[PDB]
Amino acid sequence: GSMLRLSAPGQLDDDLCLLGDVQVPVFLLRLGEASWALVEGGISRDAELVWADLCRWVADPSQVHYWLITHKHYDHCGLLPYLCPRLPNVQVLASERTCQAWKSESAVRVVERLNRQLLRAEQRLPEACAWDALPVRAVADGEWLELGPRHRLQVIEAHGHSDDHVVFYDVRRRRLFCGDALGEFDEAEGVWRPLVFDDMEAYLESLERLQRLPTLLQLIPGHGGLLRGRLAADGAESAYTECLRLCRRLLWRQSMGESLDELSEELHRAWGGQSVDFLPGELHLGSMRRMLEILSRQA
Template sequence: MLRITQVADGVHFAETKGVNWTLLTEGDSVTLVDAGYPADAPLVAASLDRIGRRPEQLLAVLVTHAHVDHIGGLPALLASAPGARVLTSEREARHARREFLEQATPRDVAANLWRPGVLPWALHIIRAGALKKVSVPAAEAITGTGPLDLPGRPVPVVTPGHTSGHTCYHLPDTGVLITGDALVTGHWTSRIDGPQRITPFFDHDREAAGTALGLLRPLPADILLPGHGPVHRGPVAEAVDTALGR
């Protein structure tokens, strides 16, 4: 399954059964945000093709966080896009290079198999390549502040908690906010729909992740593109309040 929705001028949201990514276009050039599981690599390539672009036109990949479901497709993609840079926060670049790992372990998953949806999710991610060891040695730290000189003019917003360097990307020109796993709208392991926090055992620091949502609340955005779940339309402040149960 691959569904692509153009949510704003030059902003394309790619949804799959397990995880999402976003493509930002300007002229012939593309910025990709996240890249799915290892088995999603063909779908990432297909998403570029579906919007009329080729891997060679990829200028950069922005990483929200370096879990295998968000960077798994990168090694295969970068082999056909040698000029593309991989960018994220300084802390998350180290995570992507696998200088350390902040990810739910098989033991964490086993301890949560009693939760609704966890067993089918676990079987799905095994098929998607979640047990593969994936790293991105070329990952670089974003320097400076303000919009990046890339298609979409994304503004990084570091939101530590889900991982210690998790980063969202705000697109002020289009009112879009790409939230990764800081704020999602659905998940295999959730019984609810709409803005919500990810299931607790996925967060590296649950308290910090909740605090980080406060950084998103004042942003002028009314199109939310999460790492899991469908696009959400409405003020980000309301989405944050819903996720926090306010």
């Protein structure tokens, strides 16, 4: 029947396609006859899949002009060293803090190691360019990106999930590329699972600000596809509520004397399955523990 989520590779709207894996998608925006943008930077191992899809839509790779990046996590920038060399005219648009992480050998080693863990036996990665050789340009909170005549996207700072996270708001289409700032959309239940890995105060304040946008028609997180209808319209509000709900559960359990590890293991059991293809199980469990440490400290 009719559903409030579009989650299949191919055309999502007359200007928008989903490339690659719906679990870690790259979005393609048609900005004009011979101009395109990518949104979200994916995982390295998807390089040839995303390339194959891209070339179905884009006749000449020199026509890809922008690549918008929400945050520095390994699953949101892993394609950059592999596909940017094939995109001679692309400019990577990322926050200043995101750009800074790509200059840190420590940070990029973590990104590389996690991406390497996801390589399947059959596939061959193309040659990687250096992370500090990427064609990057820093974007600022509030900045207007005039990508094409019918694509004006505002950069909105949305820290909390991570210290660098931004979202991109298409004012014309009432479409928000929200990365991981709302959490992980639960494919079985239709609710947001919080992903607070840096700062709960910031995460909630970001959601407060995003709630004040004009009512959304389309909401596109970092994983799982495109949400529409009420799922888009109430996404930020719902994500805020789910974060407060997790805080309530944690506080109640702590009042009974539970260690953080009990709820962490429960969340890992309940939620880890959705991301097994792109997130090692032990890192998922560790992430749940970190989130609960943050909520406990700040709630």
